[PDB]
């Protein structure tokens, strides 16, 4: 076995000091970040070969980085291309990576990780192979193993080593299962990092200082990890320990409970590799981890998630949908119209980013309550330790509540968030447009009404634009930017830049009824209501939504969207094509919507919907539901219920792409995941097509075949459009 794996430009600089301490400085000339790629593997192969060849003249090793970060990420381009027949190459690659780290780990001399910045994924895996971890406590630095967020697992020893350090349960829950990132203080607190320094300049000196004192005070234990000592006791016990064996069967059930039964092969594989590895020696455990890693890489879900959460997201953040050539424009003061759930959330995320915000409503009492939303959030954040008092006071001081339109003086970025009504929005904008700066963005948070119509109520229509948020705004990550017919490319890029500044992700959508998010999530909700009218058990419908991977079951979401509002969208979509000389075929859900309204069960805001409500809390499905819709009279397979909701949105997304509502599949995927909650395992409602796998097979053809099978059984809305055919 070799430290090599069969050109690559060397990535590691070698320096042996007078005392024999070898410093390995990782510096990939091909990028701003050290990445676990083919060049790294070959370079660390040479470096580890040399550490062995010169063992008689080497007393310690320091692993350092010349980049702003320590080491972050792996070779996604290669991993996403790995076919099932390439499983041997993927297995051998991580097996070679871990032979290098295992040799480094067992040289007979201490190795210290000088962590100057972010150490993520394979970067932390390198540091975990060292015996001591010193981290510079700088801004922006993060440490963690986020491989699971790409559908992978820490296959470079992260699973095996964190389980040896912390035990099965703590390593899985705290580090592995969610790929959580930690700032250096938390990293030291939980044990990922051993000690901290205030500046990066102290790092290598602190590393060499630790090597020297470790050699003097612990000469027999220097360079020996805890699991390589004879009396090693795994924290929490091994699977054969009676205390751990008692609770171990509950770990997979708690995992199914958290993931609600959705397809999540990576967490399942991490838990298996964690437990299976704790039953055997370290080397055998490491190989088991390689096999589960190769199992994920060659599977479709990891390719769905690598496509969405690596490629699509970076294409979006790099400006894929941002108009070319437009420069930067500063935002000095944001004016938010309306202090409800949306406006209060917009005012919070804006002020949290550092923007001065004027929060206007009809009364100072209302505006103050809007700012109260931010103060309830900051209060929770303070007592939980996620922020300081100084930074929290500064945030809240940036929100000025008011009821006077005169207080919008000097606003250069308007975000309107009042009631969904054409004429109200016309008047609200009319009485501020001459008060705000002449270059002010005139943004409207609307989910239904086309932007081109709302824009006519302002003089400077080239600066009117849709800025669609999602509640709760402090937690929802997407901003849907809708381009009206008069909206300029400059206004588009200014809102695009604002979105990134407040820490959200933008998609750019052309004006159309329902835009992308509202139109697509309507098909998901309407498909469930149709199933309810057909006589399917409400509990089965809700289970189908969660096991499909959705963050909220559809009947629960319907109560929160209000069935009255759903009726209005339907009444307004009928006129939108009959008053324009077209045909409108009612959705089956409208009969279900209108009978719930007829019974006074319009949703949660009224206190009664598909669920009963008591004390501001949901309390089970309404028992009159089964008699009202003859629940149980229709019992299709659960997979048919799942596919009906997934396919309805995937087909509506393709329609949006065909009509030019969306301009990229990256916007469609991230827009569906972050905007409305399309399951991450799908990679998005557009990636769901290219990666669909079921009975028939895998790919666009299998999606078309399954869509045709659905159309035969449930209606022609499932028939695939021409663009998905040969």
């Amino acid at each position: 076995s070799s430290h090599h794996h069969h050109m690559p430009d060397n990535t590691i600089q070698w320096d042996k000091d007078a005392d024999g301490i070898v410093t390995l400085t990782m510096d990939d000339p091909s990028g701003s970040t050290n990445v676990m790629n083919e060049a790294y593997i070959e370079s660390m192969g040479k470096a580890v070969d040399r550490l062995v060849a010169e063992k008689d003249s080497i007393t310690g090793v320091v692993v350092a980085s010349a980049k702003k970060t320590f080491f972050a990420g792996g070779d996604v381009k290669t991993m996403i291309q790995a076919r099932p027949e390439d499983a041997g190459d993927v297995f051998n690659t991580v097996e070679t990576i871990k032979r290098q780290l295992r040799t480094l780990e067992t040289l007979g001399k201490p190795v210290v990780a000088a962590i100057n910045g972010a150490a993520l994924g394979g970067g932390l895996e390198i540091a975990l192979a060292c015996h001591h971890r010193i981290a510079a406590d700088v801004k922006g630095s993060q440490l963690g193993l986020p491989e699971v967020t790409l559908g992978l697992l820490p296959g470079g020893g992260g699973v095996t080593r964190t389980v040896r350090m912390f035990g099965i349960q703590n390593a899985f829950v705290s580090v592995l299962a969610q790929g959580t990132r930690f700032k250096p203080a938390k990293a030291k607190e939980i044990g990922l990092v051993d000690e901290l320094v205030a500046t990066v300049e102290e790092l290598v000196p602190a590393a060499k200082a630790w090597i020297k004192e470790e050699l003097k005070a612990n000469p027999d234990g220097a360079g020996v990890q805890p699991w390589d000592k004879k009396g090693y006791k795994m924290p929490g016990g091994t699977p054969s320990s009676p205390g751990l064996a008692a609770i171990l069967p509950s770990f997979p059930s708690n995992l199914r409970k958290q993931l609600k039964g959705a397809p999540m092969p990576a967490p399942r594989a991490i838990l298996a590799a964690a437990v299976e590895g704790a039953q055997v020696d370290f080397d055998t455990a490491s190989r088991i981890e390689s096999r589960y890693f190769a199992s994920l890489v060659t599977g479709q879900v990891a390719k769905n998630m690598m496509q969405a959460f690596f490629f699509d997201l970076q294409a979006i953040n790099a400006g894929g949908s941002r108009p070319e050539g437009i420069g930067k424009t500063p935002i000095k003061r944001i004016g938010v119209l309306g202090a409800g759930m949306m406006g209060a959330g917009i005012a919070y995320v804006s002020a949290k980013a550092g923007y001065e915000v004027v929060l206007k409503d009809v009364s100072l009492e209302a505006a103050a309550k809007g700012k109260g939303y931010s103060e309830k959030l900051e209060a929770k954040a303070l007592e939980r330790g996620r922020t300081t008092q100084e930074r929290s006071d500064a945030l809240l001081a940036r929100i000025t509540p008011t009821a006077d339109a005169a207080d919008f003086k000097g606003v250069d970025f308007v975000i309107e968030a009042v009631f969904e009504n054409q004429e109200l929005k016309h008047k609200v904008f009319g009485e501020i447009e001459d008060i705000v700066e002449p270059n002010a963005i005139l943004g409207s948070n609307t989910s239904t009404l086309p932007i081109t119509g709302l824009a006519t109520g302002v003089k400077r229509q080239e600066d009117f634009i849709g800025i669609h948020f999602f509640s709760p705004v402090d937690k929802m990550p997407l901003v849907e930017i809708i381009k009206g017919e008069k909206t300029s490319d400059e206004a588009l890029a200014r809102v695009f830049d604002y979105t990134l500044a407040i820490g959200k992700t933008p998609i750019v959508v052309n004006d159309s009824r329902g835009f992308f998010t509202s139109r697509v999530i309507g098909t998901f909700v309407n498909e469930a209501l149709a199933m309810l009218g057909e006589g399917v058990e409400p509990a089965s419908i809700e289970q189908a939504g969660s096991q499909a991977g959705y963050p909220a079951p559809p009947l629960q979401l319907s109560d929160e969207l209000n069935l009255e509002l759903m009726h209005k969208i339907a009444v307004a979509t009928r006129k939108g094509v009959e008053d324009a000389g077209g045909t409108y075929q009612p959705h089956p859900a409208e009969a279900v919507v209108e009978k719930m309204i007829e019974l006074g069960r319009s949703g949660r805001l009224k206190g009664a919907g598909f669920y009963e409500y008591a004390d501001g809390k949901r309390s089970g499905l309404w028992p009159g539901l089964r008699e009202t819709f003859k629940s149980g009279s229709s019992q299709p397979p659960l997979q048919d219920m799942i596919d009906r909701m997934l396919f309805a949105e995937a087909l509506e997304t393709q329609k949006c792409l065909d009509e030019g509502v969306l301009t990229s599949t990256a916007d469609a995927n991230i827009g569906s995941i972050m905007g409305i909650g399309f399951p991450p395992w799908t990679g998005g409602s557009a990636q769901f097509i290219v990666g669909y796998s079921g009975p028939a097979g895998t790919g666009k053809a299998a999606f078309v075949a399954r869509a045709r099978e659905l159309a035969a059984a449930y209606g022609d809305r499932f028939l695939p459009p021409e663009s998905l055919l040969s």
Binding site: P249, S253, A539, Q635
Partner: protein, 402 residues
């Protein structure tokens, strides 16, 4: 076609889990004591003609490891040619041992076989032996492992058995068990346990509470100790049974089987081997069967296993005089009664595991012997014995009085 006959069927008293009388007694001693009792009843018997000893044991570790059936053959001084094999089919192990002994006699390659089971749950708790369906995440995650008690709660939810319904069955089991003891039905088959000095350790089923009232059963809290309180299992069960909204947790320690210690032995042999040793046959093994159902609900395998053994014997429910189904949980028995329309007065007529206990590996052999005695005491003809099993299995046997 060699027919198989039950010549003896005995068992120890069932000692309770906490401060139990049998906690100081090794499970091997429980089996040897029953072997010694068979010797006192047949000192004439040529033990060389005994070709095997088949013991069910669900947790064969520690005190119950190393083929406890063979250790019983050797520790009791039986001939070394008498074999000794341990088997585990979860709750059915005691009856599976009897059925396997019957099938070994029918095949004609064994003549006289001892069969039964032993389970000292106070010394070797359930789950002591490990296993992949629980302690292997990939397999656990895929088969959707749910503990048996939640399957019982789910059965009550689906069938509409209320907390009062299952408690009503718990009360009748306590009452019928106390009546069987007071009536002396158990005096000949329950062999008291004694120490190496001959001093009494236990002569009765400690777990019984013959003064149980329906008011006391209603005070008990639903199951909260053990594996079913660790989390996630309700959600796992409802992910498969996606049409029920919430599980009604009706089962308590008062309407679930008792965790006890005990052992049971049954002597099975051909008609020729019987008359060759001067043994009087007590009953005939008419037929056996094994069937199963979904492993998540887990406790509905008895119903197809009962139909299968009935089809095999050319019989129906109206041909059976007594029905004996292990009382793992009250809902499991009520489900079985509802499914097959079992008359109430034919079902578990001497009480069951709710009152007396369910020593896993031994229970099947205990309730079989319970039916051998009750058929003979009533001068009735046929009895059907069945048990639910973990992982969704089921076993059933029909015996006929001789």
């Amino acid at each position: 076609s060699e027919e198989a006959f039950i010549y003896e069927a005995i068992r120890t008293p069932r000692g309770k889990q906490k401060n139990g009388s049998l906690h100081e007694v090794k499970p091997l001693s429980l089996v040897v004591g029953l072997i010694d009792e068979l010797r006192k009843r047949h000192p004439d018997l040529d033990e060389n003609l005994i070709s095997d000893v088949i013991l069910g044991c669900v947790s064969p570790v520690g005190d119950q490891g190393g083929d406890i059936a063979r250790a019983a053959v050797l520790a009791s001084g039986m001939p070394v040619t008498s074999g000794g094999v341990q088997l585990n089919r979860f709750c059915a192990s005691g009856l599976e041992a009897v059925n396997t002994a019957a099938q070994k006699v029918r095949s004609g390659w064994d003549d006289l076989v001892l069969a039964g089971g032993v389970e000292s749950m106070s010394r070797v708790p359930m789950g002591s032996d490990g296993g992949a369906m629980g302690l292997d995440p990939a397999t656990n995650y895929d088969v959707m492992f749910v503990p048996q008690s939640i399957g019982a709660d789910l059965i009550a939810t689906i069938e509409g058995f209320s907390r009062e319904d299952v408690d009503a069955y718990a009360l009748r089991s306590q009452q019928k068990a106390a009546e069987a003891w007071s009536g002396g039905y158990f005096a000949k088959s329950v062999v008291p346990v004694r120490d190496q000095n001959g001093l009494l350790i236990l002569d009765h089923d400690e777990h019984m509470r013959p003064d149980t009232t329906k008011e006391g059963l209603a005070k008990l809290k639903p199951a909260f100790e053990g594996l079913a309180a660790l989390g996630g299992f309700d959600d796992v069960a409802l992910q498969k049974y996606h049409w029920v909204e919430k599980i009604n947790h009706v089962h308590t320690g008062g309407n679930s089987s008792g965790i006890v210690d005990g052992a049971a032995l049954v002597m099975i042999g051909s008609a020729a081997a019987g008359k060759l040793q001067g043994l009087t046959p007590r009953a005939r093994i008419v037929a056996t069967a094994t069937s199963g159902a979904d492993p998540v609900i887990m406790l509905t395998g008895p119903t197809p296993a009962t139909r299968k053994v009935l089809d095999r014997a050319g019989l129906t429910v109206d041909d059976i005089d007594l029905f004996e189904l292990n009382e793992a949980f009250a809902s499991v028995v009520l489900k079985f009664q509802k499914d097959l329309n079992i008359p109430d007065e034919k079902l578990n007529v001497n009480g069951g595991a709710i009152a007396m206990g369910h020593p896993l590996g031994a229970t099947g052999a205990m309730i079989l012997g319970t039916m051998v005695d009750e058929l003979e005491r009533r001068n009735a003809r046929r009895a059907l014995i069945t048990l639910c099993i973990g992982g969704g299995m089921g076993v059933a046997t029909i015996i006929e009085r001789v």
